[PDB]
Design a binder for this molecule. Structure first.
Ligand SMILES: CC(=O)N1CCc2c(c(Nc3ccc(-c4cnn(C)c4)cc3F)nn2[C@H]2CCOC2)C1
Length: 114
């Protein structure tokens, strides 16, 4: 199957918006991590492939996904980066876990539809 850019946007953008709607849980994920602003200079030494909601949105808007699984992979990269970097007791880690639950719920019916 070949997927057209607007087909992917129409199907997948609502799943990304579902994450944005989580407040406060999406707040640490709405923009790229800025280690200087956040006072965490070790961030890029630990996280080699940063990813965040705004980058995923831009990739959908600019047709950079050819297959739905590539979008899923970027969302999961964002989650895995946060679980790797942040401590289990931290706000960002627990917020990540909530987003992962929401994403799992929203993405499945969409994948069944395509
Ligand atoms: C995604 C990721 O790995 N990050 C690396 C670590 C990090 C990140 C944010 N950002 C952030 C955190 C919390 C809130 C927030 C808003 N409302 N509430 C109740 C909480 C908003 C944010 F933008 N802080 N920290 C660290 C630095 C000091 O604090 C924890 C991003």
């Amino acid at each position: 199957a070949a997927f057209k850019p607007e087909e992917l946007r129409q199907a997948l953008m609502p799943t990304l918006e579902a994450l944005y709607r989580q407040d406060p849980e999406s707040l640490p994920f709405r923009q790229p991590v800025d280690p200087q602003l956040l006072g965490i200079p070790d961030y890029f030494d630990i996280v080699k492939n940063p990813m965040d909601l705004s980058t995923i949105k831009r990739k959908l808007d600019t047709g950079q996904y050819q297959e739905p699984w590539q979008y899923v992979d970027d969302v999961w990269l964002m989650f895995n980066n946060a679980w790797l970097y942040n401590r289990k007791t931290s706000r960002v880690y627990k917020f990540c876990s909530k987003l992962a639950e929401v994403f799992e719920q929203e993405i499945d019916p969409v994948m069944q539809a395509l």
